[PDB]
Every structure is written in structure tokens, then in C-alpha cells.
Amino acid sequence: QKQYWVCNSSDASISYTYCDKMQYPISINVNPCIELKGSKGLLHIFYIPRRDLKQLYFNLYITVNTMNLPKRKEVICRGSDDDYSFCRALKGETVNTTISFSFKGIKFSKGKYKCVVEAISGSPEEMLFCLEFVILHQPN
Amino acid sequence: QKQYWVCNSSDASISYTYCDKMQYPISINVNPCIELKGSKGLLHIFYIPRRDLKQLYFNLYITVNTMNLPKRKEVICRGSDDDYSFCRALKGETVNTTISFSFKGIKFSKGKYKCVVEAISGSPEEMLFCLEFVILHQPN
Amino acid sequence: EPCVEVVPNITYQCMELNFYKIPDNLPFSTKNLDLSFNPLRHLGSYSFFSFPELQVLDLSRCEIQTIEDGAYQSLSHLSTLILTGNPIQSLALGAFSGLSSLQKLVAVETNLASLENFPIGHLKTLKELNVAHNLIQSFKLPEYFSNLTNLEHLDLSSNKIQSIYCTDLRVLHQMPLLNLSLDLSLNPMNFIQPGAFKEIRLHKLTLRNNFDSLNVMKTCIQGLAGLEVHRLVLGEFRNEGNLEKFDKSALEGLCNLTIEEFRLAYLDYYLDDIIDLFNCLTNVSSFSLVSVTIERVKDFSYNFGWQHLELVNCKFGQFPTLKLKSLKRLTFTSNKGGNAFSEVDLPSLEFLDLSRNGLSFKGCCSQSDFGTTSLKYLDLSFNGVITMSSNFLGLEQLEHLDFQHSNLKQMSEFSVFLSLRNLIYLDISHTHTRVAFNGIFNGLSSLEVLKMAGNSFQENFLPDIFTELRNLTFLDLSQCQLEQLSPTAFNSLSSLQVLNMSHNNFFSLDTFPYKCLNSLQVLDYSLNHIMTSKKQELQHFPSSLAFLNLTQNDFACTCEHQSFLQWIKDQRQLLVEVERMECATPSDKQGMPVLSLNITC
Amino acid sequence: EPCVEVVPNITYQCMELNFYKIPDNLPFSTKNLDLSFNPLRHLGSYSFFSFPELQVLDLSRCEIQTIEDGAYQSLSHLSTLILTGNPIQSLALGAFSGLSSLQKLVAVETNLASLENFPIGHLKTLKELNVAHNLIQSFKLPEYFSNLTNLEHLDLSSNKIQSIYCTDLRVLHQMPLLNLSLDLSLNPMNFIQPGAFKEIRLHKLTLRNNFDSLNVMKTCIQGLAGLEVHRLVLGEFRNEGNLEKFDKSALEGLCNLTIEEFRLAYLDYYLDDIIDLFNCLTNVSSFSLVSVTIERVKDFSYNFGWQHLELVNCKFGQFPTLKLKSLKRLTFTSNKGGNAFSEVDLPSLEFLDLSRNGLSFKGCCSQSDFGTTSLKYLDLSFNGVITMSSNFLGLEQLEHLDFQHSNLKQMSEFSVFLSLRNLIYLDISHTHTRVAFNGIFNGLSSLEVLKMAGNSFQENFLPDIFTELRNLTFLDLSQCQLEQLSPTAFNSLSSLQVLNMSHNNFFSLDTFPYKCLNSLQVLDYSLNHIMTSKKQELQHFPSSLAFLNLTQNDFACTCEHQSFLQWIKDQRQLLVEVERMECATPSDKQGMPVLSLNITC
Ligand SMILES: *[C@@H]1O[C@H](CO)[C@@H](O[C@@H]2O[C@H](CO)[C@@H](O[C@@H]3O[C@H](CO)[C@@H](O)[C@H](O)[C@@H]3O)[C@H](O)[C@H]2NC(C)=O)[C@H](O)[C@H]1NC(C)=O
């Protein structure tokens, strides 16, 4: 498997690889790099979906240095008149977008956090891609 | 056992008798009589306790025409600097008082509601009296 | 067989298979062929001849430079084309020649430049035309649109449309019967000369994120006058740049139009008062807000004529105080900010839904909390903490009631559902309830569905609480940590068909309680630990019983209670998945299905 | 033996037994004789001679008209008299003659008229004197009070005291060392001439419900000037008539006094703003409100010097916003009105208690919610809904934490107690928690007591979550519906002494998990259904085990697993109440104690 690097901060080393048989390319950037201490920034994405990005959502499987957390379900855009403009896209339509984010207020232990991301969308609710992220964390 | 009548309203027939071996007299009045539909009135009490009315409370055992409800615990006056003046009384000290009450907002079925009242007080937490009330209810 | 085969001889999809021509080995009679992400640099005359019968075609990202005249010729019954992402620099006039029944045409991300040099002018029965993300400078409808009827959707979003002129839409005046849902989103526009829209009729109109300031938006809304749109949608997107300002002067002049349904989607400015805004959006029959942060607003009370109101995903500071004389339906779901509830006054309200807000009640339910007297539907599920202090007084016409996953309190202190004499559906599941009063379900004489899963009982004993529920057909008592039943509990339940008793802690299987249930069809005893019985009295079940789930629970396959296993193998016409019932206690006999074992003794 | 006998030869109580004289059959050496509600119309000289040694005497409602001189003569060691309810119309001078050590004298409901013709003037070592509900018109202390030292309480409530004069309390000036807790409640008073209290020192003073208007109260408070009371209590009673009015002008002039602790108990007027009231009650070191309805108050933020604040049983509209620079302890318990929580700013706070209010949190716990950084104690039990969105950040010095019977949320989504490295006590019981993350108890390296009863686990399996809790001595896992243990779960718990595992659903008793717990003393497996074991491997328990409760659960006394019952009867030096362990499964062998049965086979 090939390793795709993203960014380094003072206390993080985000990276990712592909989950399943499908290996459709994707371009992800974050500016500035995420500090696992409370951060704020922009997330730029360039993609060409293989299904309609309609009622897209994410399944998140997180692991904290070999302890599993429960499965998370994040609904990105819902039904009709959604917050984001990119989720009216169709197959083969280029998506080229930027989303702002911010967070703070939780202490994390040192270790090797890992996250499997499963995107689900479409009318028959099939999967779009699966990525596996790896985050190393050494405070200071 | 002797039956002590209290008052009649348009839809209630309150009455009471004594529970246990102790049969210390007590004078209870309500004006106007309680309507089991939402009411408001005054409760006049004349009594001579056999123990100190200190940190008094009530245990209530209610029965709705042969179905028991859970036991209720009503704290009348608590610790120090209590709301009522009568619960600084001592044994043999006359209590002669009036308390206002009001309620509304619950539908009751016809039947033969029954309530056993156990007063507990004192420093070693012993019982003061026990009365058994009977309420007949026929709406309209 | 390169192409994947989805449905036998009908649907054949094969994407990303590095093709260079239409495949030939596919059946002669197939429909809805998916063929995308395959390099086909050029499309030729009579390309699809192996498929005389066909419904759906799809050519996405199949990088096509030129479609020549006569393609798709031998192809009718084709109701859909998807030409998304194909860079087309020369579309030969006369293409799309033979398509007698074409309804949908998707040409997105094609390098379109205008609509008069677009060969769809002989088409008909065409309903939807999506040309979005193209390069279109002028919103002038060409003449052939008159010939083109049945058109219902026309999406031209994310184009380069800068201005509108009165000469545009000079066509569309000679259309007596015309339903057109238009969409112009993310078009950077700064000039709409007055009188453009006039005697025009649309069925929907969406204008999201195409105004760069407040004055631009004001003048553009002024440019609309006499438009008569049935449903108007304004707003913007969280993904892009937003309005720095939104005050009472904005959205004015929207009173020269004729609107019937309005929606505002995703403001980013912290709106501070609702009236003197939305001022001439009265007499609109349907009002809706989605993702608007009106959290510092004091005067919500005002008399609008709104027959339907919806607030979804908004942030608030306090619960809005509503006073609306004619509002039949209210939907207040998934909101975030404030967590409490206060009295509202809705004299004509029939449908209420406050779900997933997480807000608290105190003295929940009475006709003095909602102000109405004819409320047929009520949903309070997934909220924070509901305190019962009044059985539903003045709400005697209420057929649907849902509480699941809230936190009910004081539910065993009186007869809580005592007034609800016309109630069909009741759901109290995973409310932290502890049933300790026989008579909790008093007055529910019309109930048919009763769900309560996840609610314990006093000392884990099921008392006689299902009396007077004689219409009950569905009863769900699962994950209530039950250990004993009263021998006469399901009496009078002559109409029960499904009875769920799964995942409790039972040991003995008794057939006496169900002796007289003439309509039972499903009986579920699944995740228990049923090892034995009280005796060998286990008689026949009621003849109606057609399914008996007993899988997944612990059995003991030893000499003792061999008669129990004999009696269960005595009936295989009722068990469900005999593969999943096995032994567990004797470590030598483990994982062995119960019906298979022949044991001595 | 008419008189009931409480403690052998020590305490003899006999009330309502229709006596007419002191009983003679009682032992010669008895103490604390209770003798009340018995008709003794007259008390005579040397009445109590059979009791040379005696501590407590009680004559309540024993209707006594005259006590003659010389009674109680042969009676020392008597530290208490209770003459309540006796109508005394002639108390002979010289009564109470011989009582060398008398401390308490209760003369309530006696028909007293004044304090100079009261024969307690030779008494000494007398601490408390209660003369309440009498008929006393004048608050003039007699001279003999100078001779009477050690007096600490003087309750004269419910008397007819109308006015105070400067000549009153001319005594009490020649008392260098004097602690006197005075009480004047329900005395209808309308005149306190100025200068009465001056150079006077009290240790407590209670004035509840003795002012009929606002101006009367104002002038009376003016009559107090230079009083120097250590603790002042004002207010009124719900039982009587109340003040029609309470504004900022009231309670003024209370600034000429020297108060150190203040309490206001039970206002009936809906107070509307706290400052410009309580204005010159600053620099008071302790402030308290009980049963005051300050529900419409906006500006709670102001800089008082209050080192201790208490709000009990009050009604509020919003959570009061506190900004107090020096407030070490806060108690906010049992309040009623408003249900939410907002940030406070208490830079010097060490004790916090918000229990039984029923209020909700959102993002509960961080040093930005309380503004402090040295908080040793925190109690949030019996509240509504607490949402975890921050592990306790900035609260690293916190030794006590209680959550029981609240409703926690999001507790298995990260390490919630990750910062609390100095924590001794943790109580999360009957919070609706579903443990589904190994690592929920990460960071609690100093924990010694852990209580969690009533919290389920994922699929009812106990995982290895008690690692790093190496100081744990008390562990409570009861009514968690557990069915299986991991074979290595209580490892590293070398200091555990009590282990509660009562009222789960177990079937087998395994002794392997507890193989190495060298300090275990109590093991509780009570309300389970333990019938068998996994094998006959059950070895010795750790030698320290001195108690093993196994009562109340179902046993099966048949041929099969007879070895199990043999191994349990193999150890009677550890069982608890062998009377309560019996058989249940074979209906012939029912209610028979397990250790008693001798069965064949
Ligand atoms: C009685 O109530 C129980 C609720 O406890 C119902 O159980 C649910 O039954 C379905 C059907 O077996 C379960 O779904 C299964 O899920 C697994 C895992 O996702 C999947 O692999 C299976 O193929 C199947 O879809 C479900 O987990 C189970 N529990 C819940 C909470 O839904 C039961 O169906 C009810 N019985 C009747 C007769 O209605």
C-alpha cells in the first residue's frame, strides 16, 4: 500500500491510505496543519465522484492506540436545500471546494490514533470511497 | 373503630379513623371543603403533640380502589430555620395553626381512594400518630 | 465477460473497464447500459446498433470531443442521456436525430456557450433539461422553446449570467399552459432591469448565493416585479462568501410579487428581530427557515397568516413564543440552541412535532400548554426531560403519541394517560420508566400498538396491567429485565397477533399464560436463557401460532429434563432457525443443535 | 410492672398511665425517669425521695397547680427539668431549693407573668432557660441575672412584649465575659426607643415575624444601633401574616450595627432586585437565603465580600450570574425555578454543591465554567441532564466528584476523566451509562472508592477497564446486568477489600478471576441465579476472604452437579446466612437449605 502524506504540525503527523478495492484519486489539503490541541483552518478538496453526492454521510471507526471507540455517523448533507453547494454534484462532475473548521477543548493522550472513513451516498445508498487515516501525537 | 367526619363537597366525602394503639385526639378543619377537581382553601389544626415536632415528616400510603401506589415521603419542616412556626413546638405545648393550600390539573377516576398517614419526628425519629383517611369520589 | 452483470439479461454496468468502443458481446435485448469513465474519444454514426431496445444510457467522463450527425439513430425507447463531464467542442447539428421518446437530458460540465446553437429543437416529450456548470453568458431563451413543450425543469446554475433584459423571455409569453421550475444559483448577477419579469408565471424559483452585497440584492429584488412565483427559495451556502449584513430594509420590495410558499435557507448573519423583516411575507401559506441563527430575538408574537410553519436546524436563545390564529401544522425539529419549553397559543393546530431538539418540559401536557383543542398528532421523542404533572386534559382527540428516548418522570404516581380515549398508537420505549402502579394504562380503550422496550418493572414481575386494552394487536416487551409472569396477564387480549418478549431473563418456558390467545401468530422468546419448564404440562399452543422463535438461548442437554427437549422436538412446524438452537451447559455437548442430538439415558 | 421498662435498671418511662403519685416500685438507682400526661394536681415537699440518684426528670402536662417549698430537695445530679404545659398559679418562693447541678430548665406554656418573681436566683451552672409561649409584657431583665452566669440561651418567643426601653438591659453591662443567644420571635412590637441596645454584645439574635408593616420595621431597625450581634436572623413564617411590601428602602439603617453572619428566612414578597437591597450587608462573612422568591432579578453581578454563600429552597427565573472575588464555599441546593446553568466567575472557590436542583448542563465541566482553579469538592448529583464535552480541563486539584442519579451523555466517546490525577472518590451510580469504551477510566491513578451501580455494559460482558486503578479498595458493580466476566479483569487490583457483584445475572461461580486478590475480605454474590460452575476446578479462594455472601439465588439440587453442592458445603467458615440458601428447581425439593440435604445418587 502507498502512503499519502498530508501535513505536519507541532504535535501531529496526519497521513492516509486506501481501504478497499476501489482506489479513486482525491486531493486533500488543510491550512494550516491541524494541531490536536484546538485549531482553526481551511480544508480544500478536489475530487471527481463515481456516484451522486446526494444525502452523503460518513461512518467513522476510531481507534485510540488499540482501544476501539463506538462507531460514529456524521450526516454531511441531508435531503433537500442543504448547507453545502457541492452535494448537488453528479457522477463525473468535478468538485473543487473549501470548507472552514475550528475546534478546541479536549486533552488527548500520546499515541497512534487511527480512523477509518466510509463515505455513503446515492439513491440506493452505496459506498463512495473508504480511506484510513493515521495520526501520531506527541505533545510538545 | 369510630368514624370522624370532616366535610362534604360536590364530589368528595373525606373522613378518617385511627391507625395504631395510640388514639390521641386532634382537630382538623378545611374551608371550604376540598373539591377533587382543583381547589384552594385553608386548613386549621388544633393539637397537643406527645413528642417534639422537630424535623417532622409524613409517610403516605395511597390506594386507588385496591391498587397500591408507591410510598410517598413528604418533608414538612427541615433542620433549622424552617418555613412554619409550629414546628418549634415541644411535648405538651398547644399547637393552633392555619395553613393555606391550592391545587389543580389532574383527572381522577371514580372510586374509594384511601390514604394512611404516618407522622414521624423527634431526635430518635419515632412516630407521632397514624391516621387513615377515606375519600369517596363521584364526579357530578 | 468483462462487463459486470447486475440483473440477468437486463442491466449491464461496466465502468472504468478500459474500453475503446461499445462492447459487442452484450445481449441483444438489454436495457439501462452503464458505460462511464471509459475512453471514447469520438462517437460515430449508428454507434449503438447492437441495442435496438434500450431505456437508459450513461456516458460520464467518457471523454468525447465530437458527436457526429446520426448517432443514436436506431434507438428509441431511450428516456435518459447523461453526457456529464464530456468536453464537447463540436456538436454536429442534427445529432439527437432519432429519439422519439426522450424525457431527461443531462448536459453538465459540457463546454456549452449558448442555447440557440443547441440541437434540441425537434425534441418533444422532453421534461427535464439540466445545463449547469457550463459557460453561459446570456439568459435569453431561444425561439424553439415554443416548439418544446412538457418542459418542467430548467436548471442553469453556476453559469456566467451577469444581467437580465426585458427582451429576454419575450418567448414564454405565448405559453398558456406552462409549468416551469427554474433555478439560478451561484450566477454572479448585478443588474435586472425593471419590467423583465411581467405577466410571467413560474412554479418554483431558487436564488441562492448570487448577490454580493445588500444594495445589489435590494435593487435586484426591485427588478423582480409582478413575477407570480408559486414557491420562492432564497438564501446562500456555507461553502461560499456570504452577506455581511441583513437588516429590516433588506428583503423589502418583495411585496410587489405574488408568493405562495417561501423558504430562506442558511443565513450567516445573526438576525436580531423577525418583524419589520419578513414584513410583507404575510398571507404566504407556507413559511420555512433552515439553518438561520435567530438567537437574540425578543418579539416573536405577531399575527401572520401562515398555515404551515417549519424551523429546521436553527439556533435559538429562548423558545419562540408563537401566537398564530391560523397555523395548522408546526414542525420544530433538530434545533440546537435553547433547552426549555414555554406556552404557545395556536388555536387551530392539528399536527405538532418537536423531535430531536433536546428541550425540557415541566408539567408537560395539557390544553393550556398548546392553546389548541384539536391536536391529532404529537411527537416529543428524543428530547431531554419531561415531567408529568397533568394527565392530558383537554386533548381528548389525539391518535398518535410518541415519547421514545426521552426521560419521563413521575409516570407511576397517577393514571397518566387517563383522558386519551381515542388513541391508536403509543410509543414509550427507552424512557427510564419503572412501572410500579397497576393502572398506569388506564383509559386507553382504543389502543392497538403499544411499544415499551427498555423499561424495567417492579421486582421484575409482570403484573396485570393489560386490562381494558382489548383492541391491542401489537405488544412489544423486550429488554425489560423480566423474570416472572403472572399466570393471568395476557387475558382479555383476544386480538393480539404479535407478542415480543425477546431478550429478558427467563428460565422456564410456560405455555399456560398464552392458553387463550386465539389470534397470536408470532411469539418471540429469543435472547433468554430457557433451560427447563415448571413441569411437563406444556400443552399445545393456540392453533393460530405459526411462528415460535426460540433461538440463541442456553439449553442444557443432559439426562435431566430430557423430556423438555423431547417436547420441543415434538414440534418442528413452528420453530424458526433450528440451526441456531444448540446446547451450552455440558462442555462435552457444545454447539450441537438440540433437534439433532440422540442421547442415552 | 405498670411502667414500661426501656433500659435494664436505668431508664424507666411511663406516660399516660393514670397515676396519682410518684411510683414506689421503681428501682432505687434509676436515671432519666419519664413521667408525663399523668394527673398530679399538687407537688409536695420531698416528693422524689425514692430516687437519690437521677439525671433527667420530665413532668409535661402533669397538671400541677402548686409546687410547694422544698420539693426536689433530696435530688442532685439532676441536670434537666421539663415543666411544659403545667398551669402553675402559685410557685412557692424557695422551690428549686436543692439542685446543685442543674443545666436545663424548660418552663413553656406555664402561666408566667414576669421574671423578677421567678425563684431562679440561687441557680448556677444553668446554661439554658426556655420561657416561651408565656404571658410576659416587659423585656426588663431582673437584677439576679448578674448572679446567674454560664447562661447561654434565653428563648422568650411568643410573649406579649410590646416595647423596649433604655432602662431595660441596664444589667448585662457588668458582664465582661458573656455569651448570650437571644430569641424574640412572634412578639408584637411597635416601639424600640433609640439607645436601648448600646455597648451590648449578643452571640445570636432572631427576629422573625414581629413587624406588622414596612415603616414599623424601619423604625424598629433604627432603634437598634451599636448592637454588635455575631449572627442575625430575620424573616417571617409561612404560617402567619406577612409583610405586604419589601423594597430597597427597607432593611436600611442596618448599617449602624456590626453583623458578621446574616440570614433572611422566608420572604413572601416577590423580591425584584438584589442590590440597593442587602446594600450595607457587605463585609458580612456569611450570607444565606432560605425560601426567598427572587425570580425576576437581572443584575446579580456585584462585588460583595462574602466568604460563604448559601441559597436553599429558593425560586429563580434564571441561574444567578455570580461575580465574587472572595467566596470560598457555595451551596446551591434544592432550589426550584429555573433549569439551566451558566458560567460563573469565582476566582477563590474551594467547595461547590449544586445538588437536587434538577438543572441541566451543556459542556459540563472545565475551569472556564466555574472561573476557579483550586476546587476540591464538586457535587452535581440529582440534576437533570449533563452533557460531557470536555474532560476536566484546568481542574487538576479535585478529590471528590459525585454525579449519582443525574443523566450523563457522551460518556463513552473519549477519556472523560483524563485530567483528574488527584481523585479519591468517584460516584457515577444510576446515571444512564452504557460502558462501551475500554479506557473510560483512564487517568484515575489515585482512585480508592468507585461506585457505579445501575449502569449496563456492552453486550453484558465485563472488559478489562480496571487497569491503572491500583489504589482501589472499594468497588461496587451491582445491578449492572452482567452475564460474563473476562478471565483477567480484576488484575492489578491488589488492594481491593470489598467487591460488590450483587443482583446481576450470573449462572456459574468461577473462582479463577479472584485467584490473586490478596486483600479481599468481602465478596458479595447475592441476588444472582447461580446453579452450576464451568468445571470442578473451584480452588481455594484467597486466604484473606472472610465473608462470602451467596444467599437468595436459585440452586438446583439433583444428581447432576452434586459435586458443586459438595464443594460449597466444603466451606462453612465463609458463608453468611446458611438459612437463606435453598433449592428451587426440583419441585419435590423446595425450600430445603442446601447444606442440610443428604441426597442419593
Ligand atoms: C422483537 O424486538 C427485538 C428488539 O430487541 C427485535 O430485534 C431486532 O431483530 C432484528 C432482526 O433479527 C435484528 O437485526 C439483525 O441485525 C443484525 C446486525 O445488524 C443483522 O446482521 C441481521 O441480518 C438482522 O438484520 C436487530 O439487531 C434486533 N435488535 C434490534 C434492537 O433491532 C425483534 O425483531 C422483534 N421481534 C419481532 C417478531 O418483531
Ligand SMILES: *[C@@H]1O[C@H](CO)[C@@H](O[C@@H]2O[C@H](CO)[C@@H](O[C@@H]3O[C@H](CO)[C@@H](O)[C@H](O)[C@@H]3O)[C@H](O)[C@H]2NC(C)=O)[C@H](O)[C@H]1NC(C)=O
Ligand atoms: C426471530 O427473531 C427475529 C429477531 O430476533 C424476528 O425478526 C423479524 O425481525 C425483522 C426486523 O425487526 C422484521 O422485519 C421487517 O422489518 C422492517 C424494518 O423496517 C419493518 O419495517 C417491517 O415491517 C418488518 O417488520 C420481521 O418482520 C420479523 N419477522 C417476522 C416474521 O415478522 C423474527 O420474527 C423471529 N422469527 C419469526 C419466525 O418471527
Ligand SMILES: *[C@@H]1O[C@H](CO)[C@@H](O[C@@H]2O[C@H](CO)[C@@H](O[C@@H]3O[C@H](CO)[C@@H](O)[C@H](O)[C@@H]3O)[C@H](O)[C@H]2NC(C)=O)[C@H](O)[C@H]1NC(C)=O
Ligand atoms: C452491595 O450492594 C447492594 C446494593 O444492591 C447492597 O444491598 C443492600 O443491602 C442492604 C442490607 O441487606 C439491604 O437492606 C435491607 O433492607 C431490607 C428492606 O428495607 C431490610 O428488611 C433489611 O433488614 C436490610 O436493612 C438493602 O435493601 C440492599 N439494597 C439497597 C439498594 O440498598 C449490599 O449491602 C452491598 N454489599 C456490601 C457487602 O456492601
Ligand SMILES: *[C@@H]1O[C@H](CO)[C@@H](O[C@@H]2O[C@H](CO)[C@@H](O[C@@H]3O[C@H](CO)[C@@H](O)[C@H](O)[C@@H]3O)[C@H](O)[C@H]2NC(C)=O)[C@H](O)[C@H]1NC(C)=O
Ligand atoms: C450479605 O449481603 C448483604 C446485603 O445483601 C451485605 O450487607 C451488609 O450491608 C449493610 C448495608 O449496606 C452494610 O452496612 C452498614 O451500613 C451503613 C448504612 O449507613 C453504612 O454507613 C456502614 O458503613 C455499613 O456499611 C454492612 O456493612 C454489610 N455487611 C458487611 C459485613 O459489611 C452483607 O455484607 C453480605 N454478607 C457479608 C458477610 O458481608
Ligand SMILES: *[C@@H]1O[C@H](CO)[C@@H](O[C@@H]2O[C@H](CO)[C@@H](O)[C@H](O)[C@H]2NC(C)=O)[C@H](O)[C@H]1NC(C)=O
Ligand atoms: C512529519 O512527521 C513525521 C513524524 O514525526 C516524520 O517522520 C519520521 O521522521 C523522522 C525524521 O526523519 C524519523 O526519525 C522517524 O522514524 C519517522 N517516523 C515515521 C513513522 O515516519 C516526518 O519526517 C515529518 N515530515 C517532515 C516533512 O518533516
Ligand SMILES: *[C@@H]1O[C@H](CO)[C@@H](O[C@@H]2O[C@H](CO)[C@@H](O)[C@H](O)[C@H]2NC(C)=O)[C@H](O)[C@H]1NC(C)=O
Ligand atoms: C356526606 O357524603 C356522604 C357520601 O355521599 C353521605 O353518606 C351517605 O349518605 C347517604 C344519604 O343518607 C346514604 O344513602 C349513603 O348510604 C351514605 N353512605 C355512606 C358510605 O355513609 C353523608 O350523608 C354526607 N353528609 C352530609 C352531612 O350530607
Ligand SMILES: *[C@@H]1O[C@H](CO)[C@@H](O)[C@H](O)[C@H]1NC(C)=O
Ligand atoms: C479550484 O478552484 C479555484 C478557484 O479559482 C482554482 O484556483 C483552482 O485552480 C481550482 N482547482 C483546480 C484543480 O483547477
Ligand SMILES: *[C@@H]1O[C@H](CO)[C@@H](O)[C@H](O)[C@H]1NC(C)=O
Ligand atoms: C386558636 O387561635 C385562634 C386565634 O385567635 C383562636 O380564635 C382560637 O380560639 C384558638 N383555638 C382554640 C381551640 O382556642
Ligand SMILES: *[C@@H]1O[C@H](CO)[C@@H](O)[C@H](O)[C@H]1NC(C)=O
Ligand atoms: C406542473 O404544473 C401542472 C399544472 O397543474 C401540475 O399538474 C404538475 O403536477 C406540475 N408539475 C409537478 C412536477 O408537480
Ligand SMILES: *[C@@H]1O[C@H](CO)[C@@H](O)[C@H](O)[C@H]1NC(C)=O
Ligand atoms: C376498538 O375499540 C373501540 C372502542 O372500545 C370499539 O368500538 C371497536 O369495536 C374496537 N375495534 C375496532 C376494530 O375498532
Ligand SMILES: *[C@@H]1O[C@H](CO)[C@@H](O)[C@H](O)[C@H]1NC(C)=O
Ligand atoms: C459562647 O461564647 C464562648 C466564647 O468563646 C464560646 O467559647 C462558646 O462556644 C459559645 N457558646 C456556644 C454554644 O458556641
Ligand SMILES: *[C@@H]1O[C@H](CO)[C@@H](O)[C@H](O)[C@H]1NC(C)=O
Ligand atoms: C496511591 O496512589 C498514589 C499515586 O499512584 C501513590 O503514590 C500511593 O502510594 C498510592 N497509595 C497510597 C496509600 O497513597
